[PDB]
Structure formats: C-alpha cells, structure tokens
C-alpha cells in the first residue's frame, strides 16, 4: 500500500516542477501507472485478508474500492482540461494538487485498520472537494453548496467521534481486526442506542439517507464536473465502508434500529426516482437517481446478510462508474451550450451518433439491465429485502418501473427528437471525451465478464 | 570581692550541666508517616512506543 500511496505523493512535485506544456500528460500517465500498480492487492489466494502494518490492510471490501479510486483519477484529470485551459498554470497545478490529494487520502481510509485513521481522513476528504467546487464552480450557489455540504458531514461526525472515543475508553485497541474477535453483546439500553445513532448517522448523511439529502443535489449541481466524478463515485461510498466496518460492534441493536432508516431509505427511493421523472435539470436527475441508488445499499447494510453486502459492493462500484459516465455525458454538452437545462438542447444523435452510444449504455448500466454488476446488485439485495419482508418487492418494482423511465426520458428528451438548428456550436468531439467514455464503460464490461472480484466480505 | 562585670561578659552562651536528662521527643510530636516508596529500576523504552491511538513508533 505504501508502494501505492508514495508515488502518488509523488505525484505533486512531478505536477510543480514540469513543464507548463507537459504537466498534464506526464501525471495522467503515471497516474494510470498508480492504477496499474494498484492490481497486485487484487492477488488474494486465500480467505486471510491482508495486512502489510498496524496501519494498513484490505480486504475484498477495500481493494474495489482502492482501485476505482486511483483509476479515476486519470479521468476526472482529462474531464477538468477543457475547463480550466485559459487558466493560469498554477490554478491548474492546485486543481491537480487538491485531486492528488483526495486519491492518497481516499485510499488511506479504505486502507485503514483504526477508526480514528478513517476518521481524520474520512474528514480531510472535505477540504479538496469545498476547494474545488467554490473556486471553480462556474455560479453562485457554489458557497451555500459547500457550507451544506461540509456542515452536514460534521454535524453527524463529531458524534461519531464521541463514539469512537468512547468505545477506545471501553475496548482500549479501536483496532477492527480485534473489534471483531472481541466483540461483546450490548444490553440494550438507550445509552447504547445512541452510540449506534451516533456511530451511523455520520454515514448515513454521506451516502445519504432521503431524510438527509440537500447537500448531494447542490454540489453536483455546482461542481466543475471532476468533484461531481468523486462525489458520486467514492465520497457516497465512503459512508457504506463505514457501516460496513463498525456495524460488527452495535450487535444486537441493528435488529430494531435500522426500521425507521431501512423505510425511510425505501420510500425516498421511490420519492427520489420519481422527483427524477420530473426535473428540468440534468445534474440534478443524476444525483436524485444516485440518492435513489444509494438508500439500496443503506438498507441493504442495515439487513446484514451475506447477499445483502455482497450486493451492495456490487452497486457501490457499478453506481460510480455509471454514475461518472452519466457525469462527463453531461458535462460533454455543458462545455458547449453552457445549460444544465436539458431540454434546450433535445434532438442529438444526428452530430453526435457515437457518443449517444456511450449515452444508452450509461443508462442501461443505470435502469436494471441484467448481464451487468448494477442488476447484480440490485437483484440480489430485493432478494434479502425479500427474505427480509416479501412486502419490500412492491417498492422495488415500482423504483425500477420509475427507474426505467426517467433514464429513458433521459436519452429521448436529450438525443431523439429533432435537432435544435440555432445551435452552430455543437462541436463535432473530442478524443479526449470519447476516450472518456470508453474508459468508463470497459471496466464495467470486464467486472461483468468476471464479478467474482467485486463481491465483498462474504463471498 | 563582687568584681563589676566588664561591656559584654553577660550577653554570650555559658555551658551549664547539670543531673537532669534530655527530653525525649520535645512537641510531643506523633510518628511521622512513612513516604512512599520509589519504584527501583533500570528504565526500558516504552513498550510498543507511545499508545496513542494508531502511532506505530
Ligand atoms: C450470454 C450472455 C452474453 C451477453 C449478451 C448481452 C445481451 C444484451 C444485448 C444488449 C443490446 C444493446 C444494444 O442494443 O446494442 C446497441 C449498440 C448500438 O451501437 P451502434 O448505434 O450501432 O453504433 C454505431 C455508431 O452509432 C456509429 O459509429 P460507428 O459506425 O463508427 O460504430 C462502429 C462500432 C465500432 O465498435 C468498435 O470499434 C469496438 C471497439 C472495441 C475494439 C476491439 C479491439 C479488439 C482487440 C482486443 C484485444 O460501434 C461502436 O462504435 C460502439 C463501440 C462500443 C462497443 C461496445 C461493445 C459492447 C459489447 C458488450 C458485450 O450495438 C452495438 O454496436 C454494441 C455491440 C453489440 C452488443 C454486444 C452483443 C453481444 C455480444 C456477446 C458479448
Ligand atoms: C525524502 C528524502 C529525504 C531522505 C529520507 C530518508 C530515507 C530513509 O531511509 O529513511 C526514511 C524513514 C525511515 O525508513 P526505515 O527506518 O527504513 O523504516 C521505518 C518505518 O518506515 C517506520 O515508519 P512508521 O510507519 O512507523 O512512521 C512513523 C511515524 C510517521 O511520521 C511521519 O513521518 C509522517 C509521514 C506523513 C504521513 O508515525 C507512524 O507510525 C505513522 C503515522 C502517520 C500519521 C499520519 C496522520 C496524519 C494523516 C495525514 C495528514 C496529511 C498531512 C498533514 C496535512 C497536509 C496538508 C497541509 O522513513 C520515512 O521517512 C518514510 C515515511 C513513510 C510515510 C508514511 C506514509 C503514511
């Protein structure tokens, strides 16, 4: 791991001390070496996880994770060229900077063995993403979108801190190894009950839960695109590796206390994919159908059977994937209309056939197709709610009926249609984007060929 | 024969004995408790460092 996250501090005076002309090029390439390098934690030929120090491990929950992490990084770094170009070389320079950074911090906390580790870096997350969403976010909510943003993230992690304080001062270690061989059955008292809303509801605003949601439309809404990448890929995840990893210790609480948050993350699905039928703003549709996503795996956690994790890894990487892609998709017309409006411009596919391939495989990714790890996921965490309630199914149906729709109206309201000829603007494409595109749609046709990779803990 | 005695011959220390013994424990002070003990050893370095929260050294 220390082999991964040294070149990638590397990676910063590399960007200082190059050229202006050969900056770009020369990070993007060794960043795509980080990527590779990146793969030998994948060598796991056995069940016993693996630990390189008393700071670092994997498991099959990190390594997913830690990879699509230094993978990214690549592209949110060609997606952030064509902005940003007519800026000065050094703000150029610090948006590589404040990326950099949010790979190596990233990857420290799904590396990490303590909480505490997780904890400090789980929230140094924070200062990159304000950085790159005030100063280069192109309107004026950006400010309000980053105080949202950062103060319900610390609002529900200062509790977590108490909590993590707190059971130091009880266990002595806050190590998860041992967390999980000594782990002792709580009595069940309302003392401990808040020790289970305080270690879960700074991750459940992350992910988010549909009570708590404002901060996720903001920021996509309103940052440059390369946050939004990060944002919607591994920042929402972020909060799923957290219950994934402390719920081992609130046993046998999570049986009665993951009611109200497994049906408030059910209806406000369906509220979110439906909002997601009806919404003049295309970055907006993307992040209510990420937050519609997202309660899944929230519920999914709070069920905590084997299918359920294992099908919430599955859409954690499928969602971030799909949901970059959907992203740049965007962001592709963004950078030539300069309207988040998505029926302006309603009658594509005539100058940009090729990329409204990458446009229907990106929501065919995103609706349930089956050969895919997204139904995977789905499919097989309806089939814990399942076993769970059989009266879940009755959601679940109408979210994909919904899902289908609104990724449907998607495509047709912004591709088929008649082109809208006041537009001499449209471009015909960039190498750059559809690189891109492509790039984000082989690894989701590879983890298909071969999910036995993408499963988690339990399989 | 009473001779006057001269400037500074009354203003000084004159050395007495006499029968009587020493007073035993004068303030009829109590025992005195005992301190506590100093802890006797060579001193190591600290096992496993500091135990702070994930420090390693
Ligand atoms: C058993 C289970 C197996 C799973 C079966 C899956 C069932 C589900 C079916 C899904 C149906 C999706 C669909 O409707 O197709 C839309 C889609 C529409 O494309 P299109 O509108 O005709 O493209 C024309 C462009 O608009 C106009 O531009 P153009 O003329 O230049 O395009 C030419 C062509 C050029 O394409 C390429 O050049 C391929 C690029 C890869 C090069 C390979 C290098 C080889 C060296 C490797 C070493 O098309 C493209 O540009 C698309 C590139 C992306 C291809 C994605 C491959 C998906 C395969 C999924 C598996 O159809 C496709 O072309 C995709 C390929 C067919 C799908 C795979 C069929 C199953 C094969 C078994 C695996
Ligand atoms: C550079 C070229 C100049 C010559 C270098 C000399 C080369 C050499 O042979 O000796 C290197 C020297 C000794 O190597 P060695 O004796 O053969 O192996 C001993 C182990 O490495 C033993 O090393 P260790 O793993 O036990 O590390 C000792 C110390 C670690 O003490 C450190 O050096 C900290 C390193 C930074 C992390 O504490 C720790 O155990 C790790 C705790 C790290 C705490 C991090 C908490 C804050 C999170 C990060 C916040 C972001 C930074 C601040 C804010 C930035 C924004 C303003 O080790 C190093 O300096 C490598 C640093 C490793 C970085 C850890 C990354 C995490």
């Not at chain 2, 220390?13 to 006499?18: D, E, L």
Request: aromatic share 10%; glycine share 4%.
């Amino acid at each position: 791991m220390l082999k991964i996250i040294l070149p990638s501090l590397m990676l910063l005076p590399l960007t200082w001390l190059s050229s202006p002309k050969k900056t770009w090029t020369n990070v993007t390439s060794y960043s795509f070496l980080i990527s590779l390098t990146s793969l030998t934690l994948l060598w796991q030929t056995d069940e016993n996880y693996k630990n390189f120090s008393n700071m670092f491990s994997s498991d099959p929950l990190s390594t997913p994770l830690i990879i699509l992490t230094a993978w990214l990084l690549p592209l949110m770094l060609m997606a952030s060229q064509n902005h940003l170009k007519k800026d000065n070389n050094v703000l150029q320079k610090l948006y590589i900077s404040m990326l950099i950074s949010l790979q190596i911090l990233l990857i420290m906390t799904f590396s990490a063995t303590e909480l505490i580790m997780f904890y400090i870096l789980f929230e140094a997350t924070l200062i990159p993403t304000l950085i790159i969403i005030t100063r280069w976010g192109n309107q004026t909510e950006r400010l309000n979108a980053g105080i949202y943003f950062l103060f319900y993230t610390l609002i529900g992690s200062i509790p977590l801190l108490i909590a993590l304080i707190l059971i130091q001062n009880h266990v002595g270690t806050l190590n998860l190894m041992i967390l999980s061989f000594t782990t002792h059955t709580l009595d069940a008292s309302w003392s401990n009950n808040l020790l289970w809303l305080a270690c879960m509801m700074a991750f459940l605003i992350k992910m988010p839960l549909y009570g708590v949601h404002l901060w996720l439309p903001k920021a996509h809404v309103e940052a440059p695109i390369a946050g939004s990448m990060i944002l919607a890929a591994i920042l929402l995840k972020l909060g799923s590796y957290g219950m994934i990893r402390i719920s081992i210790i609130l046993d046998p609480l999570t049986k009665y206390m993951a009611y109200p948050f497994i049906l408030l993350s059910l209806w406000g699905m369906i509220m979110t994919s439906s909002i997601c039928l009806r919404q003049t703003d295309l970055k907006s549709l993307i992040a209510y159908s990420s937050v519609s996503h997202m309660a899944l795996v929230i519920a999914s956690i709070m069920i905590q059977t084997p299918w359920s994790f294992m099908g919430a890894t599955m859409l954690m990487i499928a969602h971030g994937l799909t949901s970059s892609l959907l992203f740049c998709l965007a962001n592709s017309n963004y950078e030539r209309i300069h309207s988040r409006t998505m029926i302006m411009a309603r009658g594509l596919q005539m100058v940009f056939p090729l990329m409204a391939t990458w446009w229907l495989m990106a929501s065919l990714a995103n609706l349930a197709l089956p050969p895919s790890i997204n139904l995977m996921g789905e499919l097989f965490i309806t089939m814990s709610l399942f076993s769970w309630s059989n009266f879940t199914i009755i959601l679940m149906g109408i979210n994909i009926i919904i899902t289908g729709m609104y990724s449907m109206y998607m495509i047709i309201t912004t591709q088929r249609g008649k082109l809208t000829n006041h537009m001499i603007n449209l471009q015909p494409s960039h190498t750059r984007e559809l690189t891109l595109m492509a790039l984000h749609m082989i690894p989701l046709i590879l983890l298909t060929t071969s999910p036995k990779l993408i499963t988690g803990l339990t399989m | 024969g009473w001779v006057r005695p001269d400037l500074g011959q009354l203003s000084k220390v004159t050395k007495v004995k006499t029968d009587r013994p020493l007073p035993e424990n004068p303030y009829h002070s109590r025992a005195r408790p005992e301190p506590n003990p100093v802890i006797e050893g060579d001193l190591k370095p600290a096992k496993h460092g500091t135990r702070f929260f994930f420090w390693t050294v």
